[PDB]
Design a protein around this ligand. Sequence first.
Ligand SMILES: OC[C@H]1O[C@@H](O)[C@H](O)[C@@H](O)[C@@H]1O
Ligand SMILES: OC[C@H]1O[C@@H](O)[C@H](O)[C@@H](O)[C@@H]1O
Lengths: 634, 634
Amino acid sequence: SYHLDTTAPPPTNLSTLPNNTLFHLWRPRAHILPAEGQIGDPCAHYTDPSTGLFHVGFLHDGDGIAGATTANLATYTDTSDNGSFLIQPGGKNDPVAVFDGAVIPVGVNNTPTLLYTSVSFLPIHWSIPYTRGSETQSLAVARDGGRRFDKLDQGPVIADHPFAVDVTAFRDPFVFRSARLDVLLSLDEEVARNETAVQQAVDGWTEKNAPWYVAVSGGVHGVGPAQFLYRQNGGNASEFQYWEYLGEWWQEATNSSWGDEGTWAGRWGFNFETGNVLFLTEEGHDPQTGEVFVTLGTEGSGLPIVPQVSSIHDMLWAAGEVGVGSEQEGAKVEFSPSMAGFLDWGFSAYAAAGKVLPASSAVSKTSGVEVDRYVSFVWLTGDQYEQADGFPTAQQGWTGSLLLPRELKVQTVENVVDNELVREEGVSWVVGESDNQTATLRTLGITIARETKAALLANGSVTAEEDRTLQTAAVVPFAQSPSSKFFVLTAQLEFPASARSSPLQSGFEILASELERTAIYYQFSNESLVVDRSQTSAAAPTNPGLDSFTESGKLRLFDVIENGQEQVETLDLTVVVDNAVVEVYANGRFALSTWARSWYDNSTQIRFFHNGEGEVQFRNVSVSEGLYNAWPER
Amino acid sequence: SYHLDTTAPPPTNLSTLPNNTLFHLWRPRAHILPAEGQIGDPCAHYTDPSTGLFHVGFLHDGDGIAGATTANLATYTDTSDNGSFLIQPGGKNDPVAVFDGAVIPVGVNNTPTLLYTSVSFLPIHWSIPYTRGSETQSLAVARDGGRRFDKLDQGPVIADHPFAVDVTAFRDPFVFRSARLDVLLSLDEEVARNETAVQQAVDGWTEKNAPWYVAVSGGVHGVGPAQFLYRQNGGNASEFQYWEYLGEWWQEATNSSWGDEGTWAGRWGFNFETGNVLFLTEEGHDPQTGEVFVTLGTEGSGLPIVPQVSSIHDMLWAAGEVGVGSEQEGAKVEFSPSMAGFLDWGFSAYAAAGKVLPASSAVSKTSGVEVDRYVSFVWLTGDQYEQADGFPTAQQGWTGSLLLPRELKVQTVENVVDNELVREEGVSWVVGESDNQTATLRTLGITIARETKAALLANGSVTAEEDRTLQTAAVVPFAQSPSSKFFVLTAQLEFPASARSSPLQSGFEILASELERTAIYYQFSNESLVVDRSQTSAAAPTNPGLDSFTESGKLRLFDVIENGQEQVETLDLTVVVDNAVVEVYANGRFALSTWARSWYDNSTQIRFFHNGEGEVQFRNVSVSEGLYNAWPER
Ligand SMILES: OC[C@H]1O[C@@H](O)[C@H](O)[C@@H](O)[C@@H]1O
Ligand SMILES: OC[C@H]1O[C@@H](O)[C@H](O)[C@@H](O)[C@@H]1O
């Protein structure tokens, strides 16, 4: 017998508590997750052509894909009760399980069609032999407003991985259209080599009748991770049965990495997962004019390898160009990375599943958005990918959550001093334009979906803090801190050029009280935003299931000219705290999410933090408390 | 109710009788059939390398493959009780059914391995759209002396039919080795054009490390029937997982036929089934020196087509050569017929499944055979392929039977006058040599497996009849007729050349009494051996289920020189009557099998028959009564 008293010390072993007793303790209110149970990879999102509603999907309880719908990209509604499942295993093609899938809005019977990985054998992991027929790609059609997906009555449409290729994995199909690919696959190995003649065809490209491409993720044993590319046979937009294989359009050597030291974009690892193919512009998504971007998860491991265990799950992104399939007899087209980085630096952040959100959607119509966007949903595993040291799961009654929907586009950083900080190799940006004096950088833009950001602040209480400058080491409490763990903290930190070489650490302490605190700070030593959770939970000491290791992500603040005078680029911070789900956003190009499971009701204080190394100026600091309820119907 | 009294008239409607009351009425004793129930296509035969025993397989009750073993090819033993099943559906690869398969003696784990068509969807028929994933090819390994075949724990090894090819069917894998094919696929495009340099390579071939080939039967919608050829990837005899597609090595236009009139080899039809690839010599089988022979069933139909109904099931064979796949980009190798015919002319004869029977087998060692042979088992559907007009199946308690095992080799007809009878187009033979005076013909040789023939005669009572010459029309009873419906009738009929243009019909009446009789005679009008069953069963008139239509097969008796004198080749008849199962053999190159379901115990009289047109000399006429028990353990 035990009533949850979060004003008293936590019991020694949380796992000895009755089921569902910790259900509300760290559950978010503005995030996407099922009514209960666990949530795995998001997937199968789409805009219903009929209603204009945006459908969101995600694996649930390891027993299929569940769904929800939204008309504003702020509040959601479960497609049904009892789990809200759309499709589950037990069919002829998926007797064992239902893995990730993607949706063609107008496919079979001119309705939303799901191409998903139907599983017939387990286990499946890059570190152990692959069982033939493990993963196949099958079709299902949406029924009753999309509240359910009925499997087509036949075998998989892609019943096997590439011939005689020893794949490590062959799952997570993602569908997309591309003027570039279409053109490259219709010209001559000479008339398609000159980017000139090509562009002429691109300008005349029409999306409506363009064929669909499918990128499948995995790798090849003893060779390396890769993405297998397919497209409706013969480029026939009306062909949903046969998909011609275009080869491994994207591959890397086993455990190789972007850059000469794997500093900015982790490692390619031993296997690719959940690849999404995007075409971004400076305003949003355009399969005709956008640049090719790819988001993916990579599975890593230290040595020695522990078969069936992926010690590292990196949530990466890469940008580059696509060209003809060389002269050799391999892939018909190839993707070459020109820059890469992380979509989210969080250890537990992974398997992002996104989708183009049309300006014609009911969402964009309402918010007055005139362009097409690409919204990405990142997964935040609740138990370190099932490697947690006895997390109190039965006590919590739920596991995992998705992160806030994020808009992806091409971000530009103007007026950047063209120096070594810019010209480094194996980096997460490229020079869009320069004059040897100042340049304009190009990188992946990452922001909270505008409607979600607005809803988070809509009915919130606003409390600002006075501008401040810290030089000597200090921890200064806010003049007034929130009274709950649901708020958005925003702030700008200005650093002196002399801080680059200093051991400076400046930021904030959140979710704090006498016995608990979570520190978020910038560090120049390795140019990273850091989330120290060593003191985050008073319950973690005796409950190793609550991970407390430090989280961090790289963020370079370039030298820029703002008013004729050079200065270190301002660090623009936006930290969203929804209970235990903590998301750190910066300069519209950085994201780091993690779990901050504080125990006490009173751990809501916020404080300025500076280690006394160097100096820091805090500006436009403010806190919006309350957020909102993303699930009104529950 | 009614106690079966076969000395009294049959009841008007046989279906009103209790179950199993007709179980023994027309059941054979020397044929291969299950203890009870129905038998479908024979398949999966093989010689156990360990024991030397020959294993026989067949579909049973439409619920899998059952088996039996033999050490002498005379008597058999069920592999197990309760159906004696080896493998049945319900696996992940074959959730719906288990179709025909073939066995590689030394395969996975160096044990007998079954490659079979695993079925996931029904219906399947050339006349209706094909459901993707309907038929795949999976592996299973023999366990416990072969009394069972355990499916390998993974998906099919050939998970889909050729890419984007709208097949009518894709089943019945048959495995085989070939020096010729290996050579052709190892030389250049021009080096494999000159039979000279090609023969050198063949002479050095070695079966031990030769890769396995797999022929799958079916067709292509709107194109025609065909055989799909595959072989262990890269010619690697050690590779059982991946099979490279070599193309449609054998195809024919929809419902086309051998010859300008479909006279000698029926029609190619709308779909090919049960294709077996053989390499025959004048003494038996040799994958190194034998001429390519193929046996197959073809599904036919008159117009208008009745979807899901194959009105004609022809049991055909074809011989020819295999060359490099033309110049274009089609099948890598190609089979070109030089002659074709019927393996069995019976309406109900079909789906032959054979296998190489090594001289190293226990069967051959015992009987002292020094060469490898090819033994073929022909199916005799019990109910006109399930199109019977209400056959009393419940009353009989069993359905179908296989015909006697038959030896297939190259047969030679020597001293044949090289005239128009030999040079007709689209025929079942080819001239092996000639001097414009006499020639030697080459054709498919069909004889009863020697050990089975010997067993049929071993303990039988012999009764000869005096040589006789009938000139007027007459029906003359034998001086002494058998007293049972288990006997072997042999005879030789000599005709004068003048008989070729005559309306002559000469032969015998068997299974006769006052109220019943079955006529078997040769007819020069259309050069055919005929089995008239219009009076076969006193029960047929009120039981349409008992088919009574005339059965016939083409047999040309050439002009030959036997003693410096020309004569019409002797018609050498061997008629095996194994109860209702009747098999008519002639000149070692013809077979016609059917069901002769006489009712009365006394219908065992045999008579000479001549229609008075022309003349006929009967010689060496004899009857061996009794046959033998093929299943001593039952
Ligand atoms: O269980 C199948 C696969 O699921 C993926 O989500 C994991 O990241 C892999 O390590 C695993 O092999
Ligand atoms: O059920 C499937 C197939 O079985 C074969 O034996 C029949 O002869 C075909 O007509 C049929 O398509």
